[PDB]
Amino acid sequence: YIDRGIPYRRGYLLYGPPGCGKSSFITALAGELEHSICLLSLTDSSLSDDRLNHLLSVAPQQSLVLLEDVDAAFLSRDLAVENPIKYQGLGRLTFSGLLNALDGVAS
């Protein structure tokens, strides 16, 4: 990664019908790799974009940041086609904030 300038990050998505084993597999993998799990709730009330960036910047080493049920934070489908991606949450988080936090300039 370093010799080619690519940011040293990675992300994974596990999607499917409920009751198939996403969370269980994530827990098993975290156990296998001797990592820890950082439970982050996107749809919180005290979470803001700067706070999100800071939290993603101070995550413990050898840890898996876990964003569970990402589709519940922001509207989709009809609203995705619509110009604003409205944040159906309680805090002060926005879609662009999450996009930049996951992969931006300060990530």
Contacts with other proteins by CB under 8 A lie at 4-6, 48-50, 53-54, 57-58, 60-61, 92, 94, 96-97, 100, 103-106
Among the listed ranges 41-49, 51-59, 76-84, 98-106, the one in contact with ligand ATP (CB under 6 A) is 98-106
Q: Does 22 bind Mg ion (CB under 5 A)?
A: yes
Q: Does 23 bind Mg ion (CB under 5 A)?
A: yes
DSSP string, the chain: -GGGT--S--------STTSSHHHHHHHHHHHTT-EEEEE-TT-SS-BHHHHHHHHHSPPSSEEEEE--GGGTB--THHHHSS---B-SSSB--HHHHHHHHSSS--
